[PDB]
């Protein structure tokens, strides 16, 4: 377990899923080449931008204590314990998965230090009676289930199946989806859950249990990334081809369709409404394993991505600028979270130190309660690295969440040379779909896959 620490006047924590789910041997195995590393580097880039920003903490240089959660609650809680060892840092911009953020908030509220998540959308995190020193730039996931139900009603998918992961993300997501589908005349065929320590055989059995109902031609997903990938692989191995409805776990991630791009074609997924940062790409492409010794996880990711071997010094010519780079739907959220923490610290400084620029005697002990209260209300700023067209700004509501907006993607272009997603609509206090971009939804190509108990029999002869 390696520690990444920066130097600054006041240090803030962070917990990023740099490594993937822990295997049976070690606590965590492979490196998240797209979620953990990219979000970590985006947080580092935004911190470097704030440290060079004269309007946001000009004289106060804020540091970092970013760590790896290893996609597991045990390792995440151990890193949060390493965080709270000082009070046993000021804030924590950390927590991707739901249960990770849950345990981190449980441990941090115990020491009264705030936390601004960037990927955990669980609804139970909005409970301020249980997690009061917690916030997030991503909105909760109970109206995300509303968007999924509205999409299902748009295509008249009544008899649908459900699949999710155990914990705090899949359970609440499935509950919200069922509550919003019972009100939209959409039925649940099979209500199931998947575990954390899984295998290929378990997902094959899950696909077999979902295949015994041929009427459920579509299954909604509230799983994580690895669970969705394993489910897609099991459906591809069992020759099961049916459209999916994915949550933020899959989203627009290309590592889920890695190898199983056939069984994932025409799957309507829902991701968070964001935008690609025009400056984070230039930062990540200019990264090298030798000029970025600040992060050893970056060296490990470089070694595991390009099939490198630092004991062989062979890949001294590779670079990120040569390979194609694609951001995420959460990089905007991690930069918004760190910028909101920085704006909160700046407002607290200008309120408690209205004369000087550096920290004062009343500022060195950072009170987490007053910091969180000054953050939830005295934070309203245009989103950093925002395009000139949109007017998006970071505003935390009464529950410390973000505005409710989602994008709807679909997997198309079965050609092996252009494997990609396609944004077909946006959900913002209402449903908006453009079926002209979906291949199977267009009537010229063919009818849409229906999922109902029985056929819509005509009233002329047969009654209902």
């Amino acid at each position, epitope marked *: 377990k390696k520690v990444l620490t920066l130097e600054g006047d006041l240090v803030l924590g962070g917990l990023f899923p740099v490594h993937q789910k822990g295997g049976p041997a070690e606590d965590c195995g492979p490196v998240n080449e797209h979620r953990g590393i990219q979000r970590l580097e985006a947080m580092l880039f935004a911190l470097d931008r704030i440290n060079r920003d004269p309007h946001l903490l000009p004289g106060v240089r804020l540091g970092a204590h970013i760590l790896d959660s290893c996609s597991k609650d045990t390792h995440a809680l151990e890193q949060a314990l390493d965080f709270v060892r000082a009070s046993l840092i000021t804030g924590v911009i950390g927590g991707s998965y739901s249960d990770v953020s849950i345990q981190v908030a449980n441990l941090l509220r115990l020491f009264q230090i705030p936390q601004i998540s960037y990927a955990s959308t669980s609804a139970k995190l909005s409970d*301020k009676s249980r997690y009061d020193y917690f916030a997030r730039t991503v909105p909760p996931d*109970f*109206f995300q289930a509303k968007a999924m139900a509205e999409i299902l009603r748009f295509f008249n998918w009544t008899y649908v199946s459900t699949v999710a992961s155990e914990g705090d993300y899949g359970e609440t997501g499935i*509950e919200a989806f069922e509550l919003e589908a019972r009100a939209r005349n959409i039925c649940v065929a099979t209500s199931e859950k998947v575990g954390r320590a899984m295998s290929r055989a378990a997902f094959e059995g899950v696909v077999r249990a979902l295949l015994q109902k041929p009427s459920a031609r579509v299954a909604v997903l509230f799983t994580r990334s690895e669970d969705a990938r394993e489910l897609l692989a099991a459906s591809q191995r069992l020759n099961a081809s049916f459209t999916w409805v994915a949550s933020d776990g899959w989203g627009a991630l290309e590592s889920v369709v890695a190898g199983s791009e056939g069984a994932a074609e025409g799957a309507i997924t829902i991701e968070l409404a964001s935008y690609p940062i025009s400056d984070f790409a230039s930062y990540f492409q200019s990264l090298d394993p030798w000029n970025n010794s600040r992060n050893p996880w970056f060296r490990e990711f470089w070694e595991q991505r390009f099939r490198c071997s630092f004991r062989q010094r062979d890949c001294a010519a590779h670079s990120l600028r040569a390979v194609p780079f694609e951001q995420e739907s959460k990089i905007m959220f991690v930069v918004n979270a760190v910028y909101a923490m920085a704006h909160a610290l700046h407002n607290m400084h200008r309120a408690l130190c209205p004369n000087t620029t550096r920290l004062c005697d009343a500022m060195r002990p950072v009170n987490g309660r007053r910091l969180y209260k000054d953050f939830v209300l005295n934070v309203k700023f245009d989103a950093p690295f925002r395009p000139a067209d949109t007017h998006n700004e970071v505003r935390f509501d009464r529950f410390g969440d973000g505005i409710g907006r989602y994008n709807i993607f679909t997997y198309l272009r079965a050609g092996s040379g252009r494997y990609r997603y396609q944004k077909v609509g946006y959900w913002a206090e209402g449903l908006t779909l453009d079926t002209s971009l979906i291949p199977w939804a267009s009537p010229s190509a063919g009818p849409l896959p229906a999922s109902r108990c029985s056929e819509p029999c005509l009233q002329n002869e047969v009654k209902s």
Partner: nanobody
Amino acid sequence: VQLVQSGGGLVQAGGSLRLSCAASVRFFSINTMGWYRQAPGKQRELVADITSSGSTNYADSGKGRFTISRDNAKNTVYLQMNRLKPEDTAVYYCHADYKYTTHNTAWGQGTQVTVSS
């Protein structure tokens, strides 16, 4: 949902008082909203409640008192102190019932309502 309260007041016996309790909609169907009273370290007692449909109930000693009025537009409940007494020195709270897979009740902050001689 979050429950905000206003109108604490420090009045004597036989005076008038208005306690308002508001909430946030958040596209949630709050089906019941009422008031409660309790002392620090004791049990809570209902004093007034409305199910947003006309059914209104009170406490056993406040049948003719604790006039309440609510509306489904702003989701706000207003209570009036009809007749005061030195026995209601406890702090008051307002609750809101929302049914989203939990059937949970959301409470509010404390409002000090005390009546002296």
